[PDB]
Design a protein around this ligand. Structure first.
Ligand code: MNS
Ligand code: HG
Ligand code: ZN
Length: 255
């Protein structure tokens, strides 16, 4: 599978039937129909003990992996029950600044979208978590083009070393707190992974406030490759899935 004409999102259902399921992501967030829920607790993000280990190009995007062997970087509160460990974060972006995000707000598309993946610790490991309706929690953050995000530069500079599919690089001491917006106000709904296997095990938490990154920073994202070394160059752009039908789901807002 991929994001091309012959293997893109519209073809995924053939190999992964769940693509046409009841709680698929992403979705369009209609701000006017979202239900303000006063019982939603504030988000608790404890990223001070985070330990980043490696950065890798997997052929669809690049991932920054964290040591999830202990409660070092955890997420809790909000609509969540229990503790969720940060295992990795990645992005989705477009070829142009007007597209790239997976979730949209009132049909509005952002330049990119950051996903911080966490798994429910009561399940022992990520692999067991993907077998539960509440096994994962993904924190989604929109990126818009404007001023440079200082905390993103270290990621942007290492991109040269993982240009092609399969390449990885040591990436220690990265602090994800530098990618967070000022406000933790959010929207939440039950969904799925946005890439195959598209499992419906995710509690999505999409932040209302976007972070700004510069044109130069976003440009470097667009210099990565979908292909492996030695193969014809396919620029890794537009690695996002279109919005899926909300179906029988309600989007709740913490505000
Ligand atoms: C398989 N593992 C690593 C995953 C868990 C949860 C979400 C994932 C997403 S996404 N786009 O849904 O956040 C993309 C790729 C892998 C994911
Ligand atoms: Hg599941
Ligand atoms: Zn993602």
């Amino acid at each position: 599978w991929g994001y091309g004409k012959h293997n893109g999102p519209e073809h995924w259902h053939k190999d992964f039937p769940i693509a046409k399921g009841e709680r698929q992501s992403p979705v369009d967030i209609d701000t006017h129909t979202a239900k303000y829920d006063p019982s939603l607790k504030p988000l608790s993000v404890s990223y001070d003990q985070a330990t980043s280990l490696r950065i890798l190009n997997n052929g669809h995007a690049f991932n920054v992996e964290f040591d999830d062997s202990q409660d070092k970087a955890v997420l809790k509160g909000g609509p969540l029950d229990g503790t969720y460990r940060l295992i990795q974060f990645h992005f989705h972006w477009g070829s142009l600044d007007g597209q790239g995000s997976e979730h949209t707000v009132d049909k509005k598309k952002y330049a990119a979208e950051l996903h911080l993946v966490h798994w429910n610790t009561k399940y022992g490991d990520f692999g067991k978590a993907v077998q539960q309706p509440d096994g994962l929690a993904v924190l989604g953050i929109f990126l818009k083009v404007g001023s440079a995000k200082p905390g993103l530069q270290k990621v942007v500079d290492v991109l040269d070393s993982i240009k092609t599919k399969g390449k990885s690089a040591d990436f220690t001491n990265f602090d994800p707190r530098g990618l967070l917006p000022e406000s933790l106000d959010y929207w939440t709904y039950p969904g799925s992974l946005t890439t195959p296997p598209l499992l419906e095990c995710v509690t999505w938490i999409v932040l209302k406030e976007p972070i700004s990154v510069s044109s130069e920073q976003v440009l470097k994202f667009r210099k990565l490759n979908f292909n492996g070394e030695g193969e014809p160059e396919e620029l890794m752009v537009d690695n996002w899935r279109p919005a899926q039908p909300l179906k029988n789901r309600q989007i709740k807002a913490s505000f």
